Tab-separated table of N, CA, C and O and ligand atoms in Angstrom:
chain	number	residue	atom	x	y	z
B	1	UNK	N	115.156	129.570	99.537
B	1	UNK	CA	115.277	128.788	98.313
B	1	UNK	C	114.631	129.527	97.150
B	1	UNK	O	113.662	130.259	97.335
B	2	UNK	N	115.178	129.300	95.958
B	2	UNK	CA	114.670	129.846	94.705
B	2	UNK	C	114.463	128.696	93.723
B	2	UNK	O	115.407	127.953	93.423
B	3	UNK	N	113.245	128.582	93.174
B	3	UNK	CA	112.879	127.580	92.178
B	3	UNK	C	112.112	128.287	91.074
B	3	UNK	O	111.166	129.033	91.356
B	4	UNK	N	112.535	128.093	89.830
B	4	UNK	CA	111.808	128.640	88.685
B	4	UNK	C	111.682	127.607	87.584
B	4	UNK	O	112.666	126.965	87.204
B	5	UNK	N	110.464	127.495	87.060
B	5	UNK	CA	110.126	126.686	85.892
B	5	UNK	C	109.462	127.611	84.878
B	5	UNK	O	108.348	128.091	85.108
B	6	UNK	N	110.121	127.866	83.763
B	6	UNK	CA	109.527	128.746	82.777
B	6	UNK	C	110.542	129.582	82.053
B	6	UNK	O	110.177	130.446	81.255
S	101	LIG	ZN1	111.662	131.117	79.697
């Protein structure tokens, strides 16, 4: 999984 906030 890949999650990015920013
Ligand atoms: Zn950004």
